[PDB]
Amino acid sequence: HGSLGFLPRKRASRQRGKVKAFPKDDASKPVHLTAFLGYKAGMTHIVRDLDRPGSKMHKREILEAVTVIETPPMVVVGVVGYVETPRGLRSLTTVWAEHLSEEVKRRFYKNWFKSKKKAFTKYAKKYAESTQSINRELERIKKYCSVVRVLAHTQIRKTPLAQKKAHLMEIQVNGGSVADKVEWAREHFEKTVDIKSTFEQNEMIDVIGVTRGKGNEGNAGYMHRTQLNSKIYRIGAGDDAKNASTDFDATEKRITPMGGFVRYGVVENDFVMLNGATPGPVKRVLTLRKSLLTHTSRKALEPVSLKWIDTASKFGHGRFQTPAEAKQFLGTLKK
Amino acid sequence: MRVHTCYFCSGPVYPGHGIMFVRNDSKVFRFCRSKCHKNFKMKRNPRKVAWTKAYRKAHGKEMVYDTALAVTAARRNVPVRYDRNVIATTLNAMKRVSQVHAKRERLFYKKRLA
Amino acid sequence: ALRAQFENSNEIGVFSNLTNSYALVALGGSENFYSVFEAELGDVVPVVHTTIGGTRIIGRLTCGNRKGLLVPSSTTDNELQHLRNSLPDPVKIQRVDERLSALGNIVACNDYVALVHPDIERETEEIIADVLDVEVFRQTVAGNVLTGSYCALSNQGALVHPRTSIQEQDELSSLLQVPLVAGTINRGSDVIGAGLVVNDWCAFAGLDTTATELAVCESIFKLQD
Amino acid sequence: TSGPRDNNRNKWAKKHLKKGKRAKNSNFSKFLKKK
Amino acid sequence: AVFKNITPIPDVNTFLDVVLSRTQRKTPTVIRSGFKISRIRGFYGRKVKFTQDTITEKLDSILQEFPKLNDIHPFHADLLNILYDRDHLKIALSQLSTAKHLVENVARDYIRLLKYGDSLYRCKQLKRAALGRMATIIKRQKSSLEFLEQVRQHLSRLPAIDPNTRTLLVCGYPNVGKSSFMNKVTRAQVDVQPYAFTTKSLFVGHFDYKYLRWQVIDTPGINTIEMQSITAMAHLRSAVLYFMDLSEMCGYSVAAQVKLYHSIKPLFANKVTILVLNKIDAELLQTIIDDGNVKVVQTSCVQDIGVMDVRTTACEALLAARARPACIPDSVKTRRAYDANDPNRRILARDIEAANGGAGVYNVELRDKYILQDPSWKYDRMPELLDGKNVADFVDPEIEAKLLALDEEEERLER
Amino acid sequence: TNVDAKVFHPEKRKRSREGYADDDYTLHKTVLASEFVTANDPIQILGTSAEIVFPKDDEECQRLYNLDVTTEEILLCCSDLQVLGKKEFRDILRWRLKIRDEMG
Amino acid sequence: RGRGAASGTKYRMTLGLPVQAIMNCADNSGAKNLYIVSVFGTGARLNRLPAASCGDMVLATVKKGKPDLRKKIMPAIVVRQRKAWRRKDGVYLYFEDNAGVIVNPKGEMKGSAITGPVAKECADLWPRIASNAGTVV
RNA sequence: AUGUGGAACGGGGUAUUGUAAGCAGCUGCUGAGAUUAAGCCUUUGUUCCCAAGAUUUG
RNA sequence: GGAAGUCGGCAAAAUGCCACUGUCCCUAUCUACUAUCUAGCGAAACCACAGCCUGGGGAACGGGCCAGGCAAAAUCAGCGGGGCUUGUGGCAGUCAAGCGGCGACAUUGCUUUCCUAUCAUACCGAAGCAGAAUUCGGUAAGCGUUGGACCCACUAAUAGGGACUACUGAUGAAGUGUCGUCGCAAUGGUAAUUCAACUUAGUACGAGAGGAACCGUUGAUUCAGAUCAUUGGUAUUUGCGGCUGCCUGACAAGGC
C-alpha cells in the first residue's frame, strides 16, 4: 500500500531539515536553546548494560547500532523576534553582530569568489559608529515581540568536508521572559554555543533530516522526515583522547574508526552518539531538536552506561580497534 | 565482555563481528568474518592456510613461548574476589606485558631475517 | 515444606538452585521469588539474585552443594565474576568445560554423594570429585540418564520416579547411604528435580503440588524438627 | 487494545507528566542552563 | 455435572426479533425490478436459507447444552425427575427438535419453489410466506421455551454433587443439629433459623481430613424435600450420619426419630451408619443400637462439643470401609518464620519493592549484596578490557609479587 | 545409508532431515583407533564416527599413537573428524592402510 | 495452547521453518521426522506462509515414526534452526539441522531425553524442555 | 578571480587477495606481491593551473 | 523451506515415495540491448469545433444548456484511467375503536475508494451476570477481517455489500526595483493496529472446582517512515589466487 500522510512524494525543497515546530514556551522555566545542527559522520555499534526492569535482558549485555554525528559548536550571529498576529507569527525585526565570519557570508552568494564580498558592510559600519539603532531594535523586540529566534551558524570549516558555505538557521529561545531571551541573545553575539550546553548525553531528542536520494523508481527518496524519540548515548568532546573510551574499556582511543569514517573523514570535534538510524546519508547536515512534548516512558528516563565502543575498520571487515593492538597481535611487518 | 579467539585465523573476535556456529557435538565455533567462516565450510586445514596464526606457529614464525614478566596470561575458571589494589597492579602489569612482548619479538624478527 | 511458584510456573527447580550454603534465584523476573527464598533462608545463607548465560533457568544450568558450585562454559565472565563476589569464601566456584553444558540436568549432588549422567567426560568426573569432595557414581535413575532432573536429592533423603522398580530404589538408596522414596510432584509431574528444591533443613515445591506429596516430602526429608 | 488516541490513556499520560517523571526533565535542563 | 454452561433462553418474541434482525442486517437488502431473474431468485433464497440456519443454530444449542437425562449418573437423573418431571422436560426438549426439523422442511420447500419465480413480487411473497411460517412454527413453543428457561434458571443454581469422591451424607429430622455440624465442618454458610425446612435443598461442602478431600452433602429434613433426601441417600457412596435428638430439643419425639431411622434403614443399607446423639449435654435406642452399623457418638448440640470427634470417627469409619552429617546452621534452629504481622520478620525484597515503585520500576541493586571488604565501592565498575586483553585473565591476589619477581629479570636483560 | 559419499564429498551438505541416530542421546560418537584399523568397513566408520580416539590406557592405541606412521598432522586431523577435508580423509585412509600393512 | 506455559516472553528472531517443512525429532520419544502443517500465533499477513523459529510451537505430523504417534496432528516445539538468527547480545547463531521436540499443548514434552544442542532461547522460555535438556548453548 | 585555493601524480593509513619472480638448501628471503577509488581517510611530498571569457541584469 | 504459487511441475533445476529447483514465502543483486538525450533523416491514421469537476435538464442525460465548485503562460518524463427496495404466510370464526355492512390490533382453530444493515477491537445498558466464560441490545466504519484441499487449522476476528483531460513526479517566464539568505502558513493530506507476559494473585468472588480487573511495566503481530554498524545475498573492482586450452626453437614472461 503506502501511507497517505507522506504525499505528494516529491523532492524536498530544502537540504537542511526545517524545524516545523518548536517546544512550547513556558516562562516558569528559565532560558535555554531548543535545537542544534550537526553532520552525520556515520554509524557504529556499541555494547551496553541494559537497566530496564521487567525486560528479558535486565542487567544483561546487548549490542546497539549508534549513529555518530559531529557537531562543532554553533556560533550565534543574530537575534530575530516574531510577534503574535491574527494572521500568524510575523518576523518583526532582525539584529546581527559585527564580525560575521567568511563562513556565513558565503551563505549569501552563489559565487563567493567572483563577488566583491560586500555583504554586511554598511550594517557593520553603522553598528560600530552608532549602536543606538541596534539598541532601538532590541528595545522593539523586548517590547512587542513574543517569540525570539536567534540566528546561529555552524563552523563548517572544522568539519572534514569540502563545502565552505556555512549553514544558517533559527534556533528558538524557550525560557524566561522576552527580555530574558534578548539579554541571553545579546550576551552570545559573536560567541559560540557548544552542544554540551544544549544536550546532556541522556535525553531523548527528535532528529530531522532529508532522506538519501534513491532516484526515480515517481520520486523516491530525498524527502523531508522527522525521526522522533532518538536517544543520546554519549556526547563526546573532540579535545579528549578518551571520547571513545568507556569505564569498562579504558584503551585510549578516539571515536573515528580505523582508517577514518567511510566517505566522511576524521571526526576531531564535539560529536553526538544517537541510537539507531538517522535520515540522510553521511556528510549531510542533520537538525537536532528537543522533543516537542514531555514523555516519561521508561526508555526516555533510564540511564545509559556504554561498556565498549567499536572503532574497527568500517571499510571492509575490520578486526582491530586501535593500531597499537594490531601491531601487538600481528607479527612485526617488514616495515 | 569477552573477546574470544576465532577458530580459523586465531584472530580476536570483538562483539558484533562474525558468526557463531554450534557443532552437533556441542562444540561452538566463532568466526571473525565471512572469509574465515567460508574457508571452514570448505574444511581447509588451518595448519595449511598461508595467513593463519596456527600455520605460522607450525613453521616457527613466532616465538614458541613467552612467559613474559614471569607471568603473562591464562584462561581462568576459578574466579578471584575483586580488589582495588589487585586490579590496579594487574592493569599496570598487563600493559607492561605488551611492550615486553613487542620488545622481544622485535629482536626475534631481527634474528629471523639474518 | 512450602508451595511457591516462579512467575506463574510451578517448576521452581528450573528457576532456582538451593544448597546448604547458599541460594541462587533468577533475576529481573519476579523478585517475589527472591522474597520467598529470603523469607525462609535470608538470615542463614546468602540468596544470590543471579543469571547463567543470560537466562532465568540457572537451577537446571548449575550444580552445587554446601562446599562447591559448578557452572557451564556458556556462562559469561561477568556473571561468573558476579557469583564469586556475592558468594562467600568457603564456597568454591568453577567453570566446567564439559560435554553436556546443562549441569543441573545431568548431575545431582549432595555434600557426600553425587549421581551423574553416565555420558560425562573423565576430566569432568575428576574435577567434580576435586571440587565437590564427593564420591562420583556414573549411574542412572528409572533408566533415564538425566539424574539431576529425575532425582531430587538432599542430605537426608531422595526422590525418584514412581516408575522405577523397588529393587532399583533399594540399589540407589543403599549406594547413596540415605533413605529414598519413589514419589511424584505437581500432580503427576515426574521431573522431581525440576519441581522440588531441597536442602538439609528446608524444601520448596510448586504451588500445584497436592498435600499428599507434601506430606511425603516432609516425611522423607524430616523437616518437622 | 486501548488505542493511543484514548482520552483515558491521554489522561493517565498526563499524571505521569506531573510526577518526578517530569521533574527529571525540569531540573535536567537546568543542568546545561547554568553553563 | 456443572450445569452452569447453558446459554440463556430468549422468550419467543426476542427469539424472533433476534432472528429477524440478524437476517436483515447480515444479508443484502436492495434489489430492483430490472435485475436478472436469476439474481432475484438468488437474493431471496439467501434470506430464506439464512433464517433457517439462524433458527436451527439457536435450536441446536439448546438441544446440545441441556443434559441428556438417560446418559447421566442416576443421582442427578433421579434428582431431576423429582425437581423437573423428566417426562415434561423430555416432552419440552423433543418439541423443539420437532420444531427444528419443521423449520428445515419449510425452508427446503420454499427454496425449491422459488427456483420458478417469474417476477420480483412472486418471490417476495414466498419469502414472506416463508418467514411467516418459521415465525409461526416457533411461536407454538412459547410454553416449552418458558419452561426450559425456568429449568435453566434453577439448574445453574444446583450444586455439583461429587459422586466419585468419598462422601459423608447427613440426614435426619429437621433442626436436629445437622446444620450446626455442616457449618462447623464445611466452610459453606447455610442459614440456620428456628423455622422448619430451612434446608430447602441439598447443600454441598468440601472438607479436608487425613490429607484427603471429603464432600459433605447435607440433605433436606423429613414431600418434595423428603423425596430429594430419599433420592440423595438412594444412590450415593457415603456414610450415614443421622443425628438423633436425644434431648428432644428439636421438637420431635425421640421415638419418632427412631421410627424414622428404622424406616430409612432400608435406604441406609450397605452404608456406615452413625448413631449421633445430638444435644447429649442438653427403649427404641437399644433396638437401633442392636443393628451395630450405627456408631453411638454423643453430640453436645447445646454445648457445641463433639462435632470434631464425630467427623474424625466418621472419616475413620469411611477409610476402613474403603557419613551424612547434615550440619544445619544454628540460626536455623532458632529462626523466626517470616510472618507479616510481627515486625520481627526481617524486611524482604518484596517490601523494598512496594516502597520503591513496584514491579517494572524498582531496579534491584544486584551489587547491593556482595560480600566485600567495603560497601562504598559496592557500585564500582570493574575494568573488563584493555589493549586487546581482558582484565579477567590477570586477576591474581599475589600478582604484585609476580610483577616484582619480574623487575629483577628485565633489569638483567637490559644490563 | 550412503555414508561413503558424504565421507568422499565433505562439502555439499545434503540437508539431512531424517532423525537422530535412533535415540542416541549424545552425538559425540567415538571410534577406537585399534578398532578403526581392524575395521573392514572404513567408509561406514568415517561417515558415522565423529572422531577416532587413541586412548593412552589401551596398549594398541598407545602403540599406534607412538608409531612413526601416525604423524602430528594425522593425530590433529583425527582429533576432530567432523571438520576434515577430502585430502585429510584420504590421508587418514592411507594411514590406516599403512598401519594395517605393518600389523599384517 | 499457543504461547502457553512458556514462562516469560520471546524476543523477535528470524523465521526459519515455513509451513510444510521437515525437521528431525530431537527427543527419544520414538519419532524420526516431523512435518509442519500450521504455525501458532500468525496474523492476517496476506500471502505469508507461516514460519517457525527456535522456541516456537507448530502443529506437526510425525511423517516418519511409529504409527501410534502418527495419524494425530499435534503441537511441537522447534528446538533448533538452520537459518542464521541474531541474539540481542549481537552474536549470530545457526545450527546444522532443523530439529523439533514432541510436546503436549500444556507444555510438558512427551520425550524423556533430547539429543544434541538446544537453543538457548527455547531453554529460557520452556522450563519443561529445560528440565529435559542435555546441553544448551 | 591567489589561497590551512584547486588539480595531476606520489607517500602513509585502512582494506581485498593469499605469500610474486629470482636465489639458496618442501623450506627461508615472502602477512609477501598485486589492487586500493573509480561514491575510503589523510598529505609541509613533486609538478602544474587559476588573480577569465560570453550572456542577462535599476 | 522445497509445490505452500498456479485449475497445474507452465519454464528452468536435478542426468547428459525419494531428489532438485526463486513457481512461491519475498524478492535482491549483476550483464548486454531497447529505452532517454544529442547531430541528421523523417511518416500516417485521424480531424464539425473543442477539451476541469458535482448536481439538474421528461429521453440520451451530454462536452456546449442551467446552478455551483472554480480558474494564471510554456513545458519534460511515466501510468494509460477516461421515491422501487428490507422483520414478521394463507383459510375460517369471535370480538369491536369506530365509521358506514365492514371494521384496526388481538383471540381461536391445521399445516483503489465508499456504505453500515458491526465479525473483531473501544465504551455502554440489561440477563440467576458469584468469578471466569457467555447471551441480547445500543453508540461506533478509526481500525483489521488469514493461510491450505463445504471443509481444517491459525487468528482478536476471519462481517455483509456498492462503485484531448485526468493521475503521478520534473522544470519553468512573471509582476511586488533587482538578486539572495532566513522565515511565516492559507489550504490540502495524515497513521498507527492487535495480541499476551510480569506483577496487582491464586488475592476480590467461590463449599469447592476454579478465578478477574484498574494501575504500573515488558515483548510480540500487522502497517507505516527511515537506515546499512553488524550478519546474509549479489560480482564488470573483470580486485587477487587456482585450474583448463593456445604462443614464442628453450626457461621465464605475459597473452587471449
- The domain made up of E167-321 is a member of CATH 3.40.50.300: yes
* A132-144 helix and A178-186 helix, angle to the nearest 10 degrees: 150
d(CA A108, CA A91): 19
Strands G135-136, G117-118: parallel, antiparallel or unpaired by DSSP?
A: parallel
Backbone angles phi and psi of A289, in degrees to 5: -135, 155
Q: What is the 3-state secondary structure (H, E, C) of chain C?
A: CEECCECCECCCCCCEEECCCCEEECCCCCHHHHHHHHHHHCCCCCEEECCCCCCCCHHHHCEECCCEEEEECCCCHHHHHHHHHHCCCCCEEEEECCCCCCHHHHEEECCCEEEECCCCCHHHHHHHHHHHCCEEECCCECCECCHHHHCEECCCCEEECCCCCHHHHHHHHHHHCCCCEECCECCCECCHHHHEEECCCCEEECCCCCHHHHHHHHHHHCCCC
Element (H, E) at F32: strand F30-32
Residue ranges of the annotated binding site of E for GTP are 172-179, 218-222, 278-281
Three-class secondary structure of residue A282 per DSSP = coil
The contacts of residue E383 (CB under 8 Å, 6+ apart) are: A247, A248, A249, A250, B87, B91, E391
d(CA E344, CA C156): 30
Is G131–C191 a contact, with Cβ atoms under 8 angstroms apart? yes
The residue behind cell 541493586 is: E365
d(CA C133, CA C111): 7
Strands A147-153, A168-174: parallel, antiparallel or unpaired by DSSP?
A: antiparallel
Residues F91-95: contacts with CB within 8 Å, 24+ apart? F92/F46, F92/F52, F93/F42, F93/F46, F95/F69, F95/F70
Which whole-number Å values give the CA distances from F92 to B83, F45, F77, G72, in the listed order?
52, 12, 8, 47
- Give the experimental resolution in Å: 3.2
Which of C:97-126 have CB within 8 Å of B? 97, 99-101
Tell me the Ramachandran region of residue F54: left when phi exceeds 0, alpha when psi lies from -120 to 50, beta otherwise. Answer: beta
Query: Which chain A residue has its CA at the smallest distance from E383's CA?
Result: A248
CA–chain centroid gap for C24, Å, is 10
d(CA A142, CA A182): 7
Q: Which of E385, E352, E382 is nearest to E367 (CA)?
A: E382
d(CA E143, CA E286): 55
* Cβ contact C79:C32 at 8 Å: no
Task: Write out the three cell numbers for A299.
Answer: 526508555
- How many domains does chain G fold into? 1
The contacts of residue B59 (CB under 8 Å, 6+ apart) are: none
What is the CB neighbour count within 10 angstroms for residue E12? 18
Residue B17 approaches strand H within 7 Å at CB = no
* Cβ contact A70:A223 at 8 Å: no
The residue behind cell 586501535 is: A322
* Cβ contact A36:A270 at 8 Å: no
Which whole-number Å values give the CA distances from A6 to A3, A223, B27, E300, in the listed order?
6, 9, 51, 86
Q: Which of E130, E147, E156 is nearest to E96 (CA)?
A: E147
d(CA A106, CA E222): 110
Which of E363, E382, E388 is the closest to A51 by Cβ? E363
The residue behind cell 534452526 is: G81
d(CA C97, CA C93): 13
Burial classification of residue F91, based on how many CB atoms lie within 10 Å of its CB (0-12 exposed, 13-18 middle, 19 or more buried): middle
What is the CB neighbour count within 10 angstroms for residue G41? 9
The contacts of residue A148 (CB under 8 Å, 6+ apart) are: A79, A80, A81, A82, A141, A172, A173, A178, A181, A182, A185
What is the CB neighbour count within 10 angstroms for residue A247? 13
Range of the domain at G19: 1-137
* Cβ contact C29:C56 at 8 Å: yes
d(CA F7, CA A232): 54
Burial classification of residue E107, based on how many CB atoms lie within 10 Å of its CB (0-12 exposed, 13-18 middle, 19 or more buried): buried
* Structural domain spans, chain E: 13-157, 167-321
Closest residue to I20 (CA, C1′): F14
Helices and strands, number each (H, E), in chain E: 14, 7
Element (H, E) at A152: strand A147-153
Tell me the Ramachandran region of residue E349: left when phi exceeds 0, alpha when psi lies from -120 to 50, beta otherwise. Answer: alpha
Burial B29-68 (b: 16+ CB within 10 A, else e): bbbbbeebbebbeebbbbbeeeebbbbbeeeeeeeeeeeb
Burial classification of residue A209, based on how many CB atoms lie within 10 Å of its CB (0-12 exposed, 13-18 middle, 19 or more buried): buried
Looking only at Cα atoms, what is the longest distance across chain E? Answer: 124
E359 CB within 8 Å of a chain A CB: yes
Q: Which of G116, F52, G27, F57 is nearest to C119 (CA)?
A: G116
- State the amino acid at position C157 in one-letter form: G
Three-class secondary structure of residue G60 per DSSP = strand
* Cβ contact C49:C94 at 8 Å: no
Residue A238 approaches strand I within 7 Å at CB = no
Angle at C202 between CA C196 and CA C205, to 5 degrees: 25
Q: Which of E228, E243, E240, E308 is nearest to E269 (CA)?
A: E240
**Per-residue CB contacts under 7 A with strand I, chain G residues 53-72:** 59, 63
Q: Which of A303, A278, A264 is nearest to A227 (CA)?
A: A278
Which of A198, A199, A294 is the closest to D17 by Cβ? A294
Peptide-bond breaks in chain F following residues (C–N over 2.5 A): none
CATH number of E13-157: 1.20.120.1190
Tell me the CB-side half-sphere exposure of residue F95, using CA atoms within 13 A. 23
d(CA E331, CA C14): 27
What is the CB neighbour count within 10 angstroms for residue E355? 9
- How distant is the Cα of B35 from the closest Cα of chain G, in angstroms? 15
Is G130–C191 a contact, with Cβ atoms under 8 angstroms apart? no
The alpha carbon dihedral of G9, G14, G19, G24 has a sign of: negative
The alpha carbon dihedral of A32, A34, A39, A42 has a sign of: positive
